[PDB]
């Protein structure tokens, strides 16, 4: 292990889900929130209970 040959173990690291970056991702344009509801808003939600 030199600094030009680095490699983690398998499946330790995993790439962040970026959201609202085109429709080909399955999380573009609504970002996994659907259409037009209280849950579809910034801060949108209720108390947990």
């Amino acid at each position: 292990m030199k600094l030009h040959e680095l490699k983690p173990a398998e499946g330790s690291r995993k790439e962040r889900n970026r959201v609202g970056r085109g429709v080909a991702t399955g999380n573009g344009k609504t970002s996994g929130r659907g259409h037009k509801g209280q849950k579809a808003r910034s801060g949108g939600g209720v108390r947990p209970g």
Partner: protein
């Protein structure tokens, strides 16, 4: 003398000294291939195959074995956020006819 030969799922009309283009074949780039599903024979001596002419054939010489022009498959469905883009180079095999029968 022309002939009609069943190859690549389809039929082709040939002449001695004709350059054709067929599907990919398990064959190399300068070797010889032989067509055995001859269906028809033309010229002065016409003879019909039912389905094929018995034992008649066509020998031919391979020249190139390569990949065709690159069509772009793009499909599109409107106001539903759905597209594909998928490319395709369909292979071929170029032959140069030598003899009929």
């Amino acid at each position: 003398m022309f002939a009609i030969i069943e190859t690549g799922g389809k039929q082709i009309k040939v002449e001695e000294g004709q350059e054709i283009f067929v599907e990919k074949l398990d064959v190399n780039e300068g070797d010889t291939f032989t067509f055995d599903k001859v269906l028809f024979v033309g010229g002065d001596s016409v003879k019909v195959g039912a389905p094929t002419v018995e034992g008649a054939t066509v020998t031919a010489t391979v020249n190139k074995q390569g990949r065709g022009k690159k069509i772009t498959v793009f499909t599109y469905k409107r106001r539903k956020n759905s597209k594909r883009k998928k490319g395709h180079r369909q292979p071929y095999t170029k032959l140069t006819i030598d003899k009929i029968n």
